[PDB]
Amino acid sequence: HWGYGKHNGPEHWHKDFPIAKGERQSPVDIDTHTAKYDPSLKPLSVSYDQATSLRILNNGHAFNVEFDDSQDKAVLKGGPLDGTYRLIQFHFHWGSLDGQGSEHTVDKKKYAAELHLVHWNTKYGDFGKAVQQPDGLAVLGIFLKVGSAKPGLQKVVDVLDSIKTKGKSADFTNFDPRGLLPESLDYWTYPGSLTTPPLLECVTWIVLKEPISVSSEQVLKFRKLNFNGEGEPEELMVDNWRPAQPLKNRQIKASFK
Numbered sequence: 001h002w003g004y005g006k007h008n009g010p011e012h013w014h015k016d017f018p019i020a021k022g023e024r025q026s027p028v029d030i031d032t033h034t035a036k037y038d039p040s041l042k043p044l045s046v047s048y049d050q051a052t053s054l055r056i057l058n059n060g061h062a063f064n065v066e067f068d069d070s071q072d073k074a075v076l077k078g079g080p081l082d083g084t085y086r087l088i089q090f091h092f093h094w095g096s097l098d099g100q101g102s103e104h105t106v107d108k109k110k111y112a113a114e115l116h117l118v119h120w121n122t123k124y125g126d127f128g129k130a131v132q133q134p135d136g137l138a139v140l141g142i143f144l145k146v147g148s149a150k151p152g153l154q155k156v157v158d159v160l161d162s163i164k165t166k167g168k169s170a171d172f173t174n175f176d177p178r179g180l181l182p183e184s185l186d187y188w189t190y191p192g193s194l195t196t197p198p199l200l201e202c203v204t205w206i207v208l209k210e211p212i213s214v215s216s217e218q219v220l221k222f223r224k225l226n227f228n229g230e231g232e233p234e235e236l237m238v239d240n241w242r243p244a245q246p247l248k249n250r251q252i253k254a255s256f257k
């Protein structure tokens with residue numbers, strides 16, 4: 001099916017998912033000079049103290065750390081958002097080389113990877129219903145650069161050997177996603193979409209200005225994962241990012257001067 005190869009990659013997606021050419025597709029380039037400070041934007045409220053991680057899954061496109069989202073345990077509020085958005089999972093997109101991997105770009109700069117913390121609007125009752133709504137999801141995007149290790153990422157890195165191939169999952173309890181955040185919560189925000197099929201136009205994107213630093217060894221271990229299932233020819237899970245899409249009739253807003 002769809003993927004990131006020459007024959008099933010982002011240039012092909014539109015044939016099965018025509019919304020790929022839509023009016024609010026993600027990711028986008030964040031032109032820092034054109035983004036406008038919006039003094040009416042509230043501080044983000046990230047409340048992850050009660051987060052309950054359950055499982056980590058290689059889904060053949062990335063790996064998801066999944067959370068119990070059957071209660072308001074880990075929620076995102078404030079910023080551009082109206083209401084309460086529940087953390088369901090996080091995952092990353094990354095490159096084959098340190099010079100690429102992020103989906104969003106900043107003045108055309110690509111980072112080595114990008115973390116997506118995916119939340120759904122509780123007024124829609126569940127994730128499946130939320131993705132059908134224009135304000136159904138809030139995805140918190142965080143850039144990764146290669147430098148010093150991120151200690152809070154290590155527990156994720158160390159379990160990856162147990163989920164090498166598509167369809168593999170492993171218990172992953174008591175992981176605290178607060179260890180993946182940068183110090184500052186300054187952000188850019190714009191209306192967009194899922195960055196993989198089904199490419200639904202249901203996301204309020206909140207992209208943090210401050211990247212986190214991860215070590216070369218940490219990202220190298222991401223690159224040992226496989227797109228393929230067990231017993232299939234090895235294809236390394238690398239370059240699982242969609243490139244920047246046209247901004248069209250959208251304005252990117254900044255929370256900071």
Ligand SMILES: NS(=O)(=O)c1ccc(-c2cccnc2)cc1
Nearest residue numbers: 001002003007008012013015016
């Ligand atoms: N991105 S997409 O969803 O439109 C798509 C789906 C499938 C295939 C494909 C490739 C080779 C053999 N069989 C099928 C190519 C593209």
Ligand SMILES: NS(=O)(=O)c1ccc(-c2cccnc2)cc1
Nearest residue numbers: 116118139193194195196197198
């Ligand atoms: N990269 S992203 O954060 O925009 C993202 C999040 C979720 C999904 C998704 C949702 C429903 C079904 N299948 C996949 C696709 C992409």
Ligand SMILES: [Zn+2]
Nearest residue numbers: 091093116195
């Ligand atoms: Zn993503």
